[PDB]
Amino acid sequence: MGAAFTFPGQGSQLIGMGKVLTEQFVAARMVFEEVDDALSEKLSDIIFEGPADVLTLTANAQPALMAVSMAVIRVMEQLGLNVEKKVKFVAGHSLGEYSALCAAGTFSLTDTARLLRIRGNAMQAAVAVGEGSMAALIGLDEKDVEEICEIVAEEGLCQIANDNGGGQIVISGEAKAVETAVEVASQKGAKRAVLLPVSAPFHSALMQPAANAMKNALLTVNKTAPIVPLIANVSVIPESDPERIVSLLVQQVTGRVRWRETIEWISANGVNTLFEIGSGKVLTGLARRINKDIKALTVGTAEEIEAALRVLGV
Ligand SMILES: [Cl-]
């Protein structure tokens, strides 16, 4: 049966990502050139040479990861890919929703770069330093983590930020509450419970100022219905209405990334091959943990592009 394209998010960035592809294909080189122009900045120098901690800043990582994904898309398209004909659905992990929408034609490349810079800037600035944290948990189900969130409510706000599959759940919120939640998760026998004490509290109610910033930015940008539906992080259904998609992108900023349910939905609704478009193998690792029967393939190199085009029957 069919294919879905999935687009990675924060944590998939790597120094030098996309550099080889730009050397090999003008289609890839031009994506980075346009992103630099759109942002009035040589972002590509940070992408290709680091330092890693500068590339990892969310105001850099968000437009950078999208650029790598879109370079892959443009190379595939030059080599004959028609997305509307060959791809059933698109989806992406948080910032990856924007990459997915650009690949599906909803926003221009220049606008997507600017939207992601606005998003990263607004997220970095949403809460004062030290006020938020995140934590990465493995081995507790959603119900049990929701209970931990309730247990620590007296200390402060703690919410599920990502449900990633494979027993991986990321929590987020106020620093003290999240720290306590890690202690509780460890006590309950989590296989892993790791505090990220300086993280912005992504996908928590604390991100409200960044949601408001995205609402204003998304209201003015030119947009078109995507050529294939987006399986939105908030709704886990195929979305093609640009007005509703804008609302869901705003809601996404403060809400849970429902990634497990996304892969389960896609796999049950006529897709047997999940492609990860861009940098790294993070989503592919998750897909294989969620569903052992689907074929999950990375698409980041020339070789992988060729293989994906063959699987798609281009
Ligand atoms: Cl990261």
4: CATH: 3.40.366.10
- Say whether both 169 and 66 belong to one domain: no
> Known catalytic residue: 93?
no
Return the bridge partners of 137, or none: 169, 193
Distance (angstroms) between ligand 1 centre and the Cα of 141 equals 23
Distance (angstroms) between ligand 1 centre and the Cα of 62 equals 10
Tokens of 147: 């209970």
Experimental approach was X-ray
* Active-site residue (options: 44, 203, 267, 279): 203
Distance (angstroms) between ligand 1 centre and the Cα of 56 equals 6
Tokens of 295: 């074929």
Q: Is 149 left (phi over 0), alpha (psi -120 to 50) or beta?
A: alpha
Final residue before a domain boundary, out of 199, 221, 240: 199
- Say whether both 1 and 83 belong to one domain: yes
Q: Domain holding 185: CATH number? A: 3.30.70.250
- Say whether both 167 and 22 belong to one domain: no
Distance (angstroms) between ligand 1 centre and the Cα of 26 equals 28
Q: Tell me the one-letter amino acid at 42.
A: K
Number of domains in the chain: 2
- Say whether both 136 and 280 belong to one domain: no
Distance (angstroms) between ligand 1 centre and the Cα of 260 equals 20
Q: Is 137 left (phi over 0), alpha (psi -120 to 50) or beta?
A: beta
State how far the Cα of 285 lies from the Cα of 90, in Å rounded to an integer.
Answer: 18
- Say whether both 188 and 220 belong to one domain: no
Q: Tell me the one-letter amino acid at 63.
A: P
Domain extent, residue 135, equals: 127-199
Which is nearest to 262 in space by CA: 11, 6, 65? 6
- Say whether both 107 and 18 belong to one domain: yes
- Say whether both 169 and 266 belong to one domain: no
Tokens of 181: 């939640």
* Active-site residue (options: 12, 44, 69, 94): 94
Final residue before a domain boundary, out of 164, 182, 199: 199
> Known catalytic residue: 12?
no
- Say whether both 244 and 278 belong to one domain: yes
Distance (angstroms) between ligand 1 centre and the Cα of 9 equals 9
Distance (angstroms) between ligand 1 centre and the Cα of 84 equals 31
Distance (angstroms) between ligand 1 centre and the Cα of 102 equals 22
- Say whether both 154 and 217 belong to one domain: no
State how far the Cα of 92 lies from the Cα of 110, in Å rounded to an integer.
Answer: 19
Final residue before a domain boundary, out of 180, 199, 218: 199
- Say whether both 238 and 220 belong to one domain: yes
Return the bridge partners of 138, or none: 168, 192
Distance (angstroms) between ligand 1 centre and the Cα of 52 equals 10
- Say whether both 156 and 32 belong to one domain: no
- Say whether both 195 and 205 belong to one domain: no
**Rounded to 5 degrees, what are φ and ψ at 298?**
-85, 145
Distance (angstroms) between ligand 1 centre and the Cα of 61 equals 8
Contacts of 57 (CB under 8 A, 6+ apart): 120, 124
